[PDB]
């Protein structure tokens, strides 16, 4: 049997030396974060991606901020669908869902909420955390500014809403305008706060979609759901 | 095998009331949640109001919140939606929809352009 | 006879229950991978240890004394003596660098992945275990803890202070200053969170009391079990004058605190889970 | 014309329903009461695999059952030494996010999909001794669910644009496609005698595909929910599909019609993956609430209970001769579990 | 025209499927109870094997 113990012996070289390979890997896969990036059609998802960097189906960005990798992934040649291939990104640190706000019509920040809320309330992505950025705030600024409302109609509350205090208005912005971003901002909290039960945690913020500091809010939010998981896993929250 | 089919709808004027009756068949009718979506002529499909299992928790589009009422009896396998006051941008294609799996809360292809859980559609149209 | 028999029990009952939970906590690491995996559980192995440790070696010999009322192996006590300071810096020690371990974690978190190896672990543990070993044995068997002019020691002002230092008082200052960290952190936290859940209330402090009982119990059963011996320890050599008997119940409190460590760190969900397994 | 063209559907789907009906003259569940049952399997796990860093979520099996090819999350395709424990092989893989692996019949070539709609066949048997891309498989406008090789020649792809496609590996370009779905197709379990294959998909309906005709022979629909896999019996003439309403439903090919469905109550969770062993009397079920049901194929109750994965069972896999059983979960561990 | 093409194309595979050879359900599961009586023994993991045949102990 000298053969087979020189087999065996092969094969043990071979997986010490693919062990050797897989743990440079874990470390490179560890130190990594993953990102998921789902936004609407008329949402700017490739702006976003665009500003990130400076027919496939799954496009990859990759991006360092203070020494830490991440990877992001934008759904690209994909169908509508996505109830399968959603749960495969249970495992990544967090989803930036992007969500375009505008006030052939069709009521889009509805479908938004809904395909938020059935993030959030997917069987596997309750351990995900969710980034949200809501896009096109000069839109709004514009729309509102003019005079011609869409969100007012479709939203019936919205009609009878307050401002909230802790919300902190910009100098330049209309009352208006800041009620509105800081209403469509409230409607995304109330459905993540009602749907979690503190497993998981919603990140707002107020973009245009031209904006250099983005990729810092990542990092920051990244930073954030790290320290609640940790503070999780002390039980601390 | 899972057929939605629906009943009711043809010319409405505004503000009267018309019902809408969805027949379940091929499946359990309490363990899904269940919706309905109305795609507009020449606009893309938008979620309309669902009820869950029980039918406790009840959530609806704004722009139909206050107008549109949605049961469903788990006896009879129906689901019944009343339309009052309504709007001439109300008219739109009305589709009953089900829920992917069964127990769960999350609705992710409920409103998408092809969808092999919703039923055929009966035009509604409201003229003035 | 009846109070030596109650205070029997009473002992017997906490080595029991120190061997039992210190066993099914190194039970639940070693056969079940998910816990062994993470680096963060290594120096809860490494706790663990030493708490078995503390209630293998330094526990019953010291029980078995009291009722007595005599020591009866006489060269054992200064080997005995030297485990005792060995077990009871490497459990402290031990906390320490847990607590350590969640403020670098909890603070700066992609740079606790990025630095935190298991190489990184290990090199802690072994400086903690080192430590300890420098100031038990080393000084124990060239006789520099006892006073200058049965199993009592009179330890000197010198190494008292030093030891106490060393073994308490720093890992003590470094616990007080890391939890009010991590308890700043997380209060920040909580208040993110509850700014935007009162935003979706307005639309439409339990939370701040978890997280101060969870640092409150683990602060209080640590400082309320150690703070009163180590006091004690260096009062004792200056004046020397408080009895034998409460300073007795001082280290048996100390004891009982690597007694009560399995329950402040091993009610985490997986170790909920190893243990319900095992259990059942 | 919209109007007549479902009606005249309808009315063929009565027709084929009548058909079905009229056919069951007696259910399988009553023919097989006088039957011994199999009882309680205490399988155990004679092997973990330990390596893969995400979560894993397909796995296929030689023919030889030596060696196993796990796909996994993280971009990392691992063949495995299913005796030792011994990794064979370590592959990069392009793309992260990989749903299916296959291996070869010949085992020179292994195959992996993702969410890149790109099929990947890398060949083992590379001269220089490392692993290398042979081929890149593009258009696909949906993901790559889950692929099969027929042989080296030819391998058949599920994807995602409810397509299932026939590849020449040596052209690179798609010998039939497959294209009667409206719902995602999950997986395609290949026949014995590789003539015919069976998809399940999201519409709730499994298709049986005429590998050389090109279209459907057969529609199944008894299914509530999506169909997640589907699997073959050993003869060929049978198929088992999982299913997201916690109902494995066993169909039969000639009778054209759900012989019989496998439930309970206490069971509510999906099921992701089915498998069938070299008899094929105990179907082997993987679930979302992180245990494998055996179930027997007659008796329609659960012959044992695989208890040993953290997160849940993404597949399930029996080897040919049906020795052991391979399963893949989302812990990043491989359990083989031994009757 | 969409629309009308795919019902088009469910008619024409509804007709293919409809007019097909079928198997009464008895002699089907009949065949495959054959199947198994037949290659029950063959089975490893129904009937269980001592750990010399097991090539996994
Ligand atoms: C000096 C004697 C008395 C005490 C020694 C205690 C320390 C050094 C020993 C005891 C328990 C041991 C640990 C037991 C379990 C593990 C988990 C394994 O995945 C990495 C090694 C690791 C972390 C060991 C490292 C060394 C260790 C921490
Ligand atoms: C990790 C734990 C289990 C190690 C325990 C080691 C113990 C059992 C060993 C190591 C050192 C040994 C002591 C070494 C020296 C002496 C002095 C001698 O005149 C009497 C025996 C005595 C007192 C030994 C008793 C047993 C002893 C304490
Ligand atoms: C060093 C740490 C990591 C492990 C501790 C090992 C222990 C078991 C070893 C190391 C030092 C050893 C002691 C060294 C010196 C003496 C003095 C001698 O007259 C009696 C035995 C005795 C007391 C030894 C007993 C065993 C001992 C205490
Ligand atoms: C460095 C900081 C964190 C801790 C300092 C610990 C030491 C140095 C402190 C704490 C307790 C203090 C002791 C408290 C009480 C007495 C009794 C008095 O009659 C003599 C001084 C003496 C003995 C003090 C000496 C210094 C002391 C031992
Ligand atoms: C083990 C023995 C010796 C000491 C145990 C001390 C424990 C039981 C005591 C000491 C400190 C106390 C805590 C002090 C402060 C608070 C904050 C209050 O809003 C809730 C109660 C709570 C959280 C107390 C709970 C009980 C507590 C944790
Ligand atoms: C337990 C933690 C939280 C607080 C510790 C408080 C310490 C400083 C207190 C509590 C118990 C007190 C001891 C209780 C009893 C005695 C016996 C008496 O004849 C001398 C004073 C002496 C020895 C006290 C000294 C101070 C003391 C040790
Ligand atoms: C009075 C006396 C004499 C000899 C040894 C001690 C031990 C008591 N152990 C229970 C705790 C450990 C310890 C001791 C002494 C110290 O200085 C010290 O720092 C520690 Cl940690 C006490
Ligand atoms: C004074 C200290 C005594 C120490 C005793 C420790 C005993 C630990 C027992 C752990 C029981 C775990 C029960 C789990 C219950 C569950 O959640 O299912
Ligand atoms: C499981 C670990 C148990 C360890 C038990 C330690 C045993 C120590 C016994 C010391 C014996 C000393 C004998 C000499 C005494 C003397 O001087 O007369
Ligand atoms: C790492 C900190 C350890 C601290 C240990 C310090 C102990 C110093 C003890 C000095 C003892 C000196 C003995 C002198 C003997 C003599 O009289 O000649
Ligand atoms: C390694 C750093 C340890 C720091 C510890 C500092 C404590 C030093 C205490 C010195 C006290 C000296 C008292 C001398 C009394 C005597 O003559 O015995
Ligand atoms: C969860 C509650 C924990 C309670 C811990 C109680 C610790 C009891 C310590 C008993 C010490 C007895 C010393 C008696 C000495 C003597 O003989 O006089």
Redesign the interface.
């Known amino acids: 049997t000298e053969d087979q113990r020189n087999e065996?012996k092969a094969?043990?070289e071979?997986?010490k030396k693919?062990?050797k390979?897989?743990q440079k890997?874990?470390?490179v896969?560890?130190?990594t974060?993953?990102l998921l990036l789902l936004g609407a059609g008329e949402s700017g998802k490739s702006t976003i991606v665009k500003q990130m960097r400076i027919?496939?189906?799954?496009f990859?960005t990759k991006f360092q901020v203070?020494?830490?990798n991440f990877?992001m992934?934008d759904v690209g040649?994909?169908?509508?669908?996505?109830?399968?291939?959603?749960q495969?990104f249970n495992?990544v640190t967090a989803i930036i869902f992007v969500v375009a706000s505008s006030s052939?019509?069709?009521?889009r920040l509805?479908?938004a909420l809904?395909?938020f809320?059935?993030?959030w309330?997917?069987?596997?992505?309750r351990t995900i955390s969710v980034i949200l950025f809501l896009n096109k705030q000069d839109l709004l600024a514009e729309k509102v500014l003019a005079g011609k409302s869409k969100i007012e109609?479709?939203?019936?509350?919205?009609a009878r809403?307050?401002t909230?205090e802790?919300?902190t208005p910009e100098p330049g912005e209309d009352p208006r305008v800041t009620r509105a971003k800081?209403?469509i901002?409230?409607?995304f909290?109330?459905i993540?706060?009602?749907?979690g039960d503190?497993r998981h945690?919603?990140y707002?913020h107020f973009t245009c979609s031209v904006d250099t500091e983005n990729i810092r809010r990542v990092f920051n939010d990244?930073?954030?759901i790290?320290?609640?998981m940790?503070?999780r896993?002390?039980?601390?929250? | 095998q899972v057929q939605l089919q629906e009943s009711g709808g043809g010319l409405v004027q505004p503000g009267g009331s018309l019902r809408l009756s969805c027949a379940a068949s091929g499946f359990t009718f309490s363990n899904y949640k269940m919706n309905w979506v109305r795609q507009?002529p020449?606009?893309?499909l938008?979620?309309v109001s669902d009820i869950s299992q029980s039918g406790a928790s009840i959530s609806y589009?704004?722009?139909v919140?206050?107008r549109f009422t949605i049961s469903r009896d788990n006896a009879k396998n129906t689901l019944y939606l009343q339309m009052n006051s309504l709007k001439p941008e109300d008219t739109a294609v009305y589709y009953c929809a089900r829920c992917?799996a069964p127990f769960?809360?999350?609705?992710?292809?409920?409103?998408?352009?092809?969808?092999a859980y919703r039923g055929q559609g009966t035009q509604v149209t409201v003229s003035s | 006879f009846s109070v030596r028999i109650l205070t029997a029990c009473f002992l017997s009952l906490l080595i029991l229950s120190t061997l039992l939970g210190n066993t099914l906590v190194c039970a639940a690491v070693i056969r079940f991978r998910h816990l062994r995996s993470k680096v963060?559980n290594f120096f809860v192995i490494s706790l663990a240890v030493s708490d078995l440790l503390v209630a293998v070696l330094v526990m019953p010999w010291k029980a078995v004394a009291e009722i007595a009322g005599f020591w009866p192996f006489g060269s054992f006590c200064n080997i005995w003596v030297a485990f005792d300071i060995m077990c009871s810096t490497a459990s402290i020690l031990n906390l320490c660098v847990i607590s350590v371990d969640?403020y670098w974690?909890?603070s700066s978190?992609?740079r606790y992945?990025?630095k935190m190896?298991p190489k990184a672990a290990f090199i802690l543990i072994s400086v903690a275990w080192t430590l300890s070993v420098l100031i038990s044995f080393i000084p124990v068997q060239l006789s520099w803890h006892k006073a200058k002019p049965n199993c009592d020691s009179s330890l000197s002002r010198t190494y008292a202070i030093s030891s106490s230092v060393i073994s308490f008082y720093i890992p003590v200052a470094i616990m007080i200053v890391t939890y009010t960290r991590?308890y700043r952190?997380?209060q920040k936290?909580?208040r993110?969170?509850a700014?935007?859940?009162?935003?979706?209330?307005?639309?439409?402090f339990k939370?701040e009391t978890?997280?101060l009982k969870?640092?409150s119990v683990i602060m209080g059963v640590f400082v309320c079990c150690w703070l009163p011996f180590f006091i004690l320890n260096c009062i004792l050599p200056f004046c020397g004058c408080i009895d034998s008997n409460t300073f007795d119940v001082f280290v048996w409190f100390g004891w009982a605190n690597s007694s009560l460590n399995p329950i402040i760190y091993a009610?985490?969900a997986d170790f909920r889970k190893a243990f319900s397994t095992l259990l059942g | 014309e919209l109007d007549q063209l479902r009606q005249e559907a309808e009315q063929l789907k009565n027709q084929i329903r009548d058909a079905r009906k009229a056919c069951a003259d007696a259910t399988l569940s009553q023919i097989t009461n006088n039957i011994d049952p199999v009882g309680r399997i205490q399988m155990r796990t004679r092997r973990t695999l330990r390596?893969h860093?995400?979560?894993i979520?397909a796995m296929h099996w030689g023919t030889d059952s030596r060696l196993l090819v796990s796909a996994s999350?993280?971009g990392?395709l691992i063949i495995w030494?299913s005796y030792?424990t011994?990794?064979?092989?370590?592959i990069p893989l392009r793309?992260?996010?990989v749903?299916t692996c296959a291996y070869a019949p010949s085992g020179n070539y292994v195959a992996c999909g993702?969410?890149?709609?790109?099929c990947s066949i890398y060949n083992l048997k590379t001269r220089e001794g490392n692993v290398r891309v042979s081929r890149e498989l593009?258009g696909?406008?949906?993901?790559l669910?889950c692929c099969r090789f027929l042989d080296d020649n030819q391998i058949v792809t599920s994807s995602?644009?409810?397509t299932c496609a026939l590849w020449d590996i040596e052209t690179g370009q798609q010998t039939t496609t497959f294209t009667g779905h409206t719902?995602?197709v999950?997986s395609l379990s290949l026949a014995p005698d590789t003539r015919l294959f069976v998809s399940g998909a999201?519409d709730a309906s499994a298709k049986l595909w005429d590998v050389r005709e090109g279209m459907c022979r057969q529609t199944f629909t008894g299914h509530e929910s999506?169909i997640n896999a589907i699997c073959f019996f050993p003869n060929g003439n049978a198929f088992a599909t999982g299913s997201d309403d916690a109902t494995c439903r066993l169909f039969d090919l000639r009778a054209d019609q759900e012989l019989m469905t496998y439930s309970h109550d206490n069971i509510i969770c999906g099921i992701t993956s089915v498998s069938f062993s070299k008899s094929g009397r105990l179907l082997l079920a993987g679930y979302?609430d992180f245990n494998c049901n055996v179930w027997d194929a007659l008796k329609a109750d659960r012959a044992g209970v695989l208890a040993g994965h953290d997160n849940?069972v993404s597949c399930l896999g029996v080897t040919d001769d049906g020795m052991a059983v391979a399963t893949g979960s989302?812990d990043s561990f491989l359990k083989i579990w031994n009757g | 025209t969409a629309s009308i093409a795919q019902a088009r194309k469910l008619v024409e595979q509804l007709k293919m499927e409809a007019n097909i050879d079928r198997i009464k359900v008895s002699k089907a599961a009949a065949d495959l109870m054959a199947y198994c009586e037949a290659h029950a023994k063959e089975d490893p993991l129904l009937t269980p094997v001592p750990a010399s045949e097991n090539p996994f102990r």
């Not at chain 1, 309330?121 to 992505?125: E, I, P, V």
């Not at chain 1, 993540?192 to 749907?195: E, L």
């Not at chain 2, 992710?108 to 969808?115: E, G, L, P």
């Open positions: 065996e094969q043990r071979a997986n693919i062990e390979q897989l890997d874990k470390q896969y560890r130190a974060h993953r027919t496939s189906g799954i990859e203070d020494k830490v990877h992934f040649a994909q169908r509508d669908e996505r109830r399968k291939w959603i495969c495992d052939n019509q069709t009521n509805q479908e809904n395909l809320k059935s993030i309330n997917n069987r596997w992505l109609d479709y939203f019936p509350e919205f809403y307050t909230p802790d919300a800081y209403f901002r409230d409607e909290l109330r993540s706060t009602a749907s503190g945690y919603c707002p990244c930073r954030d790290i320290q609640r940790h503070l896993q002390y039980e601390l929250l | 507009a020449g606009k893309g938008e979620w589009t704004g722009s919140k206050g992917p769960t809360r999350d609705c992710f292809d409920v409103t998408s352009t092809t969808y | 963060t969640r974690a909890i978190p992609f992945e990025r190896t991590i952190i997380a936290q909580i993110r969170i700014a935007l859940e009162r935003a979706a209330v307005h639309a439409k939370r978890k997280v969870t640092l009610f985490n | 390596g860093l995400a979560k979520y999350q993280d990392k030494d030792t011994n990794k064979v092989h370590a793309s992260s996010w749903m993702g969410l890149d709609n790109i593009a696909h406008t949906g993901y669910s995602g644009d409810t719902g995602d999950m999201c999506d979302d849940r989302w």
